[PDB]
């Protein structure tokens, strides 16, 4: 729901305006002027294909962080760059063990916030405690305050 914004950060803006016009025809004949089910449907139809309104409304909700339920034009551009091949490859358990022995400098089987903090400060990017905090919390689904190893798989599942 955000990685698409991260990818357009990597992509250009000419694609954004091409999708502006896209959205415009994606609602050519719309009921709501945004992409509901049938709007995305006529998108696929102009694409030469015929979709079902369920997955339509779902890709509508596949970005839905707040529960917005619809395709805002912003959320629209999100959904349209969702389909460009920008960042792939779904990082997971093996290299995550290789990296978790490090990320668990405490070797708990669980990344305490100590290691995550230090390695973020090492990341070179600006390090907020919103960073380290959200990262601890998303890792730690048991919410132990420490990112378990499989909670670390969660922590680095796919994030290219």
């Amino acid at each position: 729901d955000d990685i698409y914004k991260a990818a357009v950060e990597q992509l250009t803006e000419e694609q954004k305006n091409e999708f502006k016009a896209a959205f415009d025809i994606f609602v050519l004949g719309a009921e709501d002027g945004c992409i509901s089910t049938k709007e995305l449907g006529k998108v696929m139809r102009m694409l030469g294909q015929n979709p079902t309104p369920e997955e339509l409304q779902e890709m509508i909700d596949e970005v839905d962080e707040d529960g917005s339920g619809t395709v805002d034009f912003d959320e629209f551009l999100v959904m349209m760059v969702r389909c460009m091949k920008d960042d792939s490859k779904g990082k997971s358990e093996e290299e995550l063990s290789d990296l978790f022995r490090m990320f668990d400098k405490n070797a708990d089987g669980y990344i305490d916030l100590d290691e995550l903090k230090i390695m973020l400060q090492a990341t070179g990017e600006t390090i907020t405690e919103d960073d380290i905090e959200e990262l601890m919390k998303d890792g730690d689904k048991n919410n132990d305050g420490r990112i378990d190893y499989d909670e670390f798989l969660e922590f680095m599942k796919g994030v290219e």
């Binding site: 250009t12 000419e14 694609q15 091409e18 999708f19 896209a22 030469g48």
Partner: peptide, 12 residues
């Protein structure tokens, strides 16, 4: 976007 735009899908 190519099946949509043809020539106009240049970056698309």
């Amino acid at each position: 976007m190519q099946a949509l735009l043809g020539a106009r899908a240049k970056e698309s």
